[PDB]
Amino acid sequence: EEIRTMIIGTSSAFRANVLREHFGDRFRNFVLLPPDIDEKAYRAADPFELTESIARAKMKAVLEKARQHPAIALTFDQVVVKGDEVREKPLSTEQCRSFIASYSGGGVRTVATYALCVVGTENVLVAHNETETFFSKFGDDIVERTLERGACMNSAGGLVVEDEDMSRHVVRIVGTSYGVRGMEPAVVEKLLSQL
Numbered sequence: 001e002e003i004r005t006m007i008i009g010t011s012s013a014f015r016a017n018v019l020r021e022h023f024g025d026r027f028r029n030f031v032l033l034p035p036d037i038d039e040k041a042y043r044a045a046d047p048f049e050l051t052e053s054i055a056r057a058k059m060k061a062v063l064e065k066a067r068q069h070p071a072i073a074l075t076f077d078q079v080v081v082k083g084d085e086v087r088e089k090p091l092s093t094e095q096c097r098s099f100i101a102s103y104s105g106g107g108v109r110t111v112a113t114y115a116l117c118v119v120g121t122e123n124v125l126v127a128h129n130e131t132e133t134f135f136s137k138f139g140d141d142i143v144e145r146t147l148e149r150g151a152c153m154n155s156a157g158g159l160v161v162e163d164e165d166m167s168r169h170v171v172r173i174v175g176t177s178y179g180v181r182g183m184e185p186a187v188v189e190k191l192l193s194q195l
């Protein structure tokens, strides 16, 4: 059995881009197949168990979709933790504004679960990835500039470290910026090694 195909089981353009770039030396074929599930149905308090339940639910949906259009499938789920609050994608500009403003002069975590499955098998491997990003102080003006670009709406906690203004206020990251953005290749490399 020679596996040459990766099923990219996410709608994230960034994730798809990194996967093709980093894993094109191993895989010939990259198939886009987003899970498109109702994530609101899953509600665990622990963000590690939360993201894991969602990544596994996403994998189930992807493998089902694969049956009707040898391979490995990958899914992901990621949330932000700020203080005691678990944050997903913001529901409005107002909440996003609030989210971004709160990152000034402090630390913010991301918690994720990556899942991997060889299509046709029953074992779904999972791995967690956690980051912590530390910002210097910034004011309402920088908040509005980031908001105006709109990409923040599509990230957990409205956290966009790649944003022109946000980037200028990052002091350090424990982890990698690719991890904060939702796809650290080292995590996928570790899961592949566990086959």
Ligand SMILES: [Mn+2]
Residues within 6 Å of the ligand: 048, 049, 052, 128
């Ligand atoms: Mn765990």
Ligand SMILES: [Mn+2]
Residues within 6 Å of the ligand: 039, 054, 077, 078, 088
């Ligand atoms: Mn999610």
Ligand SMILES: [Mn+2]
Residues within 6 Å of the ligand: 039
């Ligand atoms: Mn999603």
